[PDB]
Symmetry: D2
Subunit: 358 residues, 4 copies
């Protein structure tokens, strides 16, 4: 009949992302999936800092925020457990004690610097009341390229799903997945390894089975969106929630159960090629965070991906307390921080022991 | 087996957008789809104004751009042909010669004020080279609420599709449709009637048949995304390209043909509920735009929606020359303008007579 | 730039069906949308026939079902209100008293012979209990071609949707839409104008608003699938349910309300090119069918498509009661039939007068 | 703010197939994924027996066909390699010398009996010329349950995709994916472990990269369709083609390139929960099928799934020539079969020695 001459890039099967940064994104992924190491999330918003600086009588100020990061980033020895640090936009431009910017300081000390690139949560305006979307795509490439030049080699974007009445709307399921996928593509085009975070929040009275179903449903659509946008699989990371019961369920779960549900859900949704899964703690206690990761790393279920951590609260709670926002507490805070970082390092190895936590 | 109580809004079938502005949106649509009337698109970018000031040798200054609009906005008796005006961000805050802002001015003249809310084209970064997406969704509701407060009651957002080698990438077909749909929802939530502009550009060597295929393909996906986002069909409008031969195809279609193809492609993709289709001139001459629109309004094919215009170039090029960017040219400028306005008003009614119009008209394709 | 020559048919934008039957299909559609006329649905299964021969004491036999169709068809002057007849596989091969096969008998009188091509409902085996799918796609072209050679020029296929708890499963919504879509394509490739019947059943306690929501949700997905499979819009017809309250809701809707909801739903989902909509009576009484249709043809809402009927019950009820299965009842049975046919004919024209049914 | 009580099963997140055979389907998967064991494919259509007996000159009859199967199904000591057999319809009814039907036989010999349940390729009638669909979904459960009663515990259905001009149409990518996904659900509900066969045919002059792209594209949709239909991943298998250059490509890929390209394309589209991948020969020589598998099983790339085989030709070819059809050739016949089966069992374990096979293996392509 008729035959036409078209651009190979106009054919569906040739939608894979093409970027001269590919080789580098994979080298970064390799650095981020180093046995016994995980990511330190230090990207808290100025508003979230307030919720940290308040219980220690620390005025939430620009200088005190730098000290809060410094407490951890300049805790010589944490590099052994932390392969990457997700930085807040403010911190990327702050200097360490030696005059080096934090990205320079971390790089020079063998730690990959990362950056939170989303612009915050907003009402979905579709679906159910309470559901939220995430802004940030407009002017993303310009923002990311600037972070790249400053030293960052990976980034993080977070979308949230809120389980209400044992389910979540399709509007939320579809839209937030498309947001995450587009975000990952623009990230790779900018030379930044994207950490895709589709967090099914722990808030609510639902049980672990409900979390499992919603987690699976939410995650599979995220993967489809990713396939749809031609993401380079070997160049990205997933930062999901573990599958556990809700904070108001009054019910708790055993390390092995969480491991079974979490590993099984990832396996049923994620492509074997996905390089790593750096869990978020969000809601779980410091100890549970390590107990669960440890169990996950002992799971008999299939899991080709590196299973580690991307914690904020779980690595900081005890540290901030001992620290107390005071220079005379840096020693204690860093001791507490290194201990938590070490416990999780061993959890990634599956060699964690509750005994080491008293 | 097991039962559970969920919010009705969590069920797929109950995804229609909920806004307190519904009534007002529908009323606006009704005003914007008045027989014999069309929309004037005067939302060009500062950068786009420079290209228009070239023929007349005018300096692209803020004040000159104000006069450029006032030239048309303050043209006595234009409301007989114009039901709404798409304003540029800047013009929204500028005053008319009587002191009130253009939105206040237009509103008093019974003309609905509109605003171009998209933030421009950017490389798609997926699909084929040359394809572009449109930014502007971030912080959208905020900007839209402010416009609503100033008087605007409708808006316009444009996505473009470039026919290359007789096709467009799926990455572009899906993504831009999705952007348009999300935009329609945020606009309606903000109280602004959204004019969705999915433009298959006239750029290329492609023929009317290829433009027909791509248009049907590009538009049906726009419709799919709108249904997924639960757009209020009764409260939105479409601003599509007419289906015609590529600017470099070397061919030119007859009104009857353009009418057939355009109306055929709309009917095959658009829900019969869609209130109206306000065509873009997109490069056609002033006369072509009126000829084609007239034929469209005389088509024996299915077309339940109000079919009119939303022209920029096809309504200004002549009035612009006559004007000459001088004060002395206003009378001449406004006569030309009001003439094309009258012509398109006639074409909308399908009672356009090529006699009462110019015997010649040069291409406007940039 | 890396180009490649491919078949135009391998490109997404070029998926519109290609069949030599086009013009004929459009001619048939033209016939089926003759103002003042509608379709007589006479394709009741053997099982459904038993349900009607019961209240008149007629043994459900081949010869008796033939007579059942003969009552309607051999009614002189019916071609005045009926443009097409949906036949049952059995009838296609049966003969009217003059020796002509029913298809030959219809054609001769200017009435298009139609055929029910689906193979019945079966459990969906996905989604919720009570949901059903429709079999019949395997070996479809062979079957359709055989019917074509027998005089049939159009066909019908029915998929159902059961509202339960004010909703229906996405499994049901997606699968049945895909089924109808494939059906339409195969039919047109065989020379038969497909009458797509996506029926949201009246059964249930739901109210008119629930029917409106589900109908719109169900219908738009049928549309979406028809586009994916590249149906020839100019050559197909829709046989939907009217939007009305559930049969067991204990509520009633005024003809004007039914017209408003029904016309509003079709408009929000059906593309403007759709040729016609021939409503099913299913559940509605003989008069309601007429009243509602009439109200619909007086709706001030957008409706570019021919809005008529495709009734079985609403056209045969009273006729059957008068026929009683007796040869001595043909006169009255037939009078009863033409009456109803005429009423709906006027309804199609929006000139129905209730007094004519008093 | 309105709330409604619905069946949990009407919510999108709860579409996972619910069946009482789950535990069993999984047990069957355990057996079909036994270390060092692959799958024998003796389900060639009757018409395919004539298209394989010609060279060896053997009359095609129910009895001789029974012997064709008897050859290997009765070959002593094949149960250390072949963990399952995909039988043809007819072969399910036939009996083994001992009197027991093949299914009954195999079960006794530990070998799991399976059945080809699809009903052949047909014109897709959508998309590009040459593309094909696969029939058999109508009345499927009825057929499956009959097979279950006779002892069958798994089944196979195969859809094909033709690379033409280096591509395939979405019409095909979408339709065959939905067919396969539906087939999987109906199989599991019928107690049969489904082996999904999304085969990208080796026909054509396309190079390896083009097969990599298409295969990744085709398999993407299969997985997507499977997620929509709610398949029990722990209870199914995939029988895909290897990513090799076209038959008329005028090339040949080394066992290293074939492994890389193949294991990479699987990891990029298959859920990490997929139990196993039983490859097909498609047209590769009896040795390549063993080399490639072996290499595939020596890939450093991620692959949590059991990577084995489900061969026919590359497992019968020789065992066929050295049989002719007489009971005399039951020596050389069963001599060859048990060899090829021994090689693949090695390859499965990644410890296959090419020095063990012949240096003259022609293509089994047709």
């Amino acid at each position: 009949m008729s035959r036409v001459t078209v651009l190979q890039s106009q054919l569906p099967a040739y939608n894979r992302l093409k970027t001269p940064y590919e080789s580098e994104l994979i080298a970064t992924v390799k650095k981020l999936t180093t046995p016994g190491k995980g990511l330190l999330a230090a990207d808290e918003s100025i508003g979230s800092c307030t919720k940290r600086f308040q219980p220690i009588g620390l005025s939430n100020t620009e200088e005190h925020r730098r000290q809060y990061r410094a407490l951890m980033l300049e805790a010589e020895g944490f590099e052994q457990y932390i392969s990457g640090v997700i930085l807040h936009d403010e911190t990327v431009g702050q200097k360490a004690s030696n005059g080096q910017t934090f990205p320079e300081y971390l790089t020079a000390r063998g730690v990959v610097p990362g950056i939170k690139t989303d612009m915050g949560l907003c009402p979905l305006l579709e679906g159910a009341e309470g559901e939220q979307m995430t802004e940030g795509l407009d002017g993303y490439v310009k923002r990311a390229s600037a972070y790249y030049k400053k030293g960052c080699r990976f980034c993080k974007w977070r979308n949230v799903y809120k389980i209400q009445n044992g389910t979540v709307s399709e509007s939320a399921v579809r839209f937030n997945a498309e947001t995450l996928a587009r975000y990952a593509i623009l990230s790779q085009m900018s030379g930044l390894v994207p950490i895709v975070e589709p967090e099914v929040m722990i808030d609510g009275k639902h049980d672990i089975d409900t979390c499992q179903r919603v987690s699976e449903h939410v995650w599979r659509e995220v993967v489809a969106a990713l396939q749809r946008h031609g993401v380079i699989w070997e160049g990205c990371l997933l930062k999901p929630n573990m599958v556990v019961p809700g904070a108001e369920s009054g019910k708790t779960a055993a390390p092995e159960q969480v491991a079974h549900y979490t590993v099984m859900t990832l396996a049923r949704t994620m492509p074997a090629m996905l390089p790593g899964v750096m869990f978020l703690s969000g809601g779980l206690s410091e100890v549970q965070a390590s107990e669960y990761l440890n169990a996950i790393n002992n799971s008999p279920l299939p899991r080709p991906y590196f299973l580690s951590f991307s914690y904020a609260r779980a690595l900081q709670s005890s540290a901030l307390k001992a620290w107390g926002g005071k220079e005379s507490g840096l020693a204690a805070g860093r001791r507490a921080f290194l201990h938590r970082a070490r416990m999780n390092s061993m959890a990634q190895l599956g060699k964690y022991k509750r005994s080491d936590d008293d």
